[PDB]
Design a protein around this ligand. Structure first.
Ligand code: HEM
Length: 289
C-alpha cells in the first residue's frame, strides 16, 4: 500500500510559511487556553496522534490521509482532548483551504515545537486526504499503564528504535495530563520546549501512587508526575543511558528529537524523487513578526 506525496497544486515554500505564520500568530493570541499553557502542547500531541496510528507492516494509518477528521478516529478514547487542537486549526484551514488535512495537522505540531523555542523540524508537504474507509480503527495508540518492554515493542510498529523512542518522549516536557481526558492528573504546565523531562526523571524523588481514577502514576515531592510508560525509561537500563545522555546534552536531544519527530510525521509517505526538499520554516521571531 503506497501513499505518494503530491504537492498542493501551484503551492511553494512561501505558501506554507504563511500557514506556519498564521498558526504561530494564533498561538501567541489565544494564550489563555488551559490555564495559560496555550495550545502549543496539544497541537504537538495532535500531530503525534494522527501519525502514531501508522503500522509499518501494511502501511495503514499515519499522517498521510488526514483521517482524524473522520468520526471514528476523532472520537477514539485515546484522542480525548485533541478536539481542542482541531478547533484551533479550523480557522487556519478556512484561511488556507488548499492545504490538505494531514499537512495542516502535522504542520501544526512543527509550528508549535518551533514557536515553543524547540529545535527546527524540517517538514515536507504533500499529504493527500483519503476517504473515510481508510480511517484506522481505534486502539493503535499506546497505553500509559505499561512497562519498558511494552513501550519498546509498541514503537517497533512505528519503526522507532530506543534512541528515537526516548527522544520523542521528551515532548512530555510540554503541557500536562487532564483527569477528564486520560485518567491522570498533574504535570509541569510548561509551554517551553526543553530537555527538562530527562532532568526531572533523574533529579526528582519519585513515589509510585494510585490516583483518584485508580491509575498508577509516579509523583514527586516537588509536584511533578510521570506515567508508568515515562518512568520505564529509567527502569530499563538501555533507555536509562539515553535519558542520561539527553539530560546532559541539550543540543543532542534537540537534533535527535527533530529527526525522530519529522520521521514520525512522514512515516508511510513515499516522496517521489522530484519532490521538493524539506522546508525549514522561520519562527515569527526570526521574521521580526
Ligand atoms: C508510550 C507513549 C506515550 C504515551 C502512553 C503517552 C500518553 C500521554 C497521556 C496519557 C497524556 C495526557 C493526556 C491528557 O490527559 O490530556 C499525554 C500528553 C502529551 N503527550 Fe504523550 N504519550 C506518549 C508519547 C508521546 C509522544 C511520542 C509525544 C510527542 C512526540 C507526546 C506528546 C504529548 C504531549 C504534547 C502531551 C500534552 C498534551 C496537552 O498538554 O494537552 N507523547 N501523553
Amino acid at each position: 500500500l503506497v501513499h505518494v506525496a503530491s504537492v498542493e497544486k501551484g503551492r511553494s515554500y512561501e505558501d506554507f510559511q504563511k500557514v506556519y505564520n498564521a498558526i504561530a500568530l494564533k498561538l501567541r493570541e489565544d494564550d489563555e487556553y488551559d490555564n495559560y499553557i496555550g495550545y502549543g502542547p496539544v497541537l504537538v500531541r495532535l500531530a503525534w496522534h494522527i501519525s502514531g496510528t501508522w503500522d509499518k507492516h501494511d502501511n495503514t494509518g499515519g499522517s498521510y490521509g488526514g483521517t482524524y477528521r473522520f468520526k471514528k478516529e476523532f472520537n477514539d478514547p485515546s484522542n480525548a482532548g485533541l478536539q481542542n487542537g482541531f478547533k484551533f486549526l479550523e480557522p487556519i484551514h478556512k484561511e488556507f483551504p488548499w492545504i490538505s488535512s494531514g499537512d495542516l495537522f502535522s504542520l501544526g505540531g512543527v509550528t508549535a515545537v518551533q514557536e515553543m523555542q524547540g529545535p527546527k523540524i524540517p517538514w515536507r508537504c504533500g499529504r493527500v486526504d483519503t476517504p473515510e474507509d481508510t480511517t484506522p480503527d481505534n486502539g493503535r495508540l499506546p497505553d500509559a499503564d505499561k512497562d519498558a518492554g511494552y513501550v519498546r515493542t509498541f514503537f517497533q510498529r512505528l519503526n522507532m528504535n530506543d534512541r528515537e523512542v526516548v527522544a520523542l518522549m521528551g515532548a512530555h516536557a510540554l503541557g500536562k495530563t487532564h483527569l477528564k481526558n486520560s485518567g491522570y492528573e498533574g504535570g509541569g504546565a510548561n509551554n517551553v520546549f526543553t530537555n527538562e523531562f530527562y532532568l526531572n526523571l533523574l533529579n526528582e524523588d519519585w513515589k509510585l501512587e494510585k490516583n483518584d481514577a485508580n491509575n498508577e502514576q509516579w509523583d514527586s515531592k516537588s509536584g511533578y508526575m510521570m506515567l508508568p510508560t515515562d518512568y520505564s525509561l529509567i527502569q530499563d537500563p538501555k533507555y536509562l543511558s539515553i535519558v542520561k545522555e539527553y539530560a546532559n546534552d541539550q543540543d543532542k536531544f534537540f537534533k535527535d528529537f527533530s529527526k525522530a519527530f519529522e520521521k514520525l510525521l512522514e512515516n508511510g509517505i513515499t516522496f517521489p524523487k522530484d519532490a521538493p526538499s524539506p522546508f525549514i520554516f522561520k519562527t515569527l521571531e526570526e521574521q521580526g513578526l
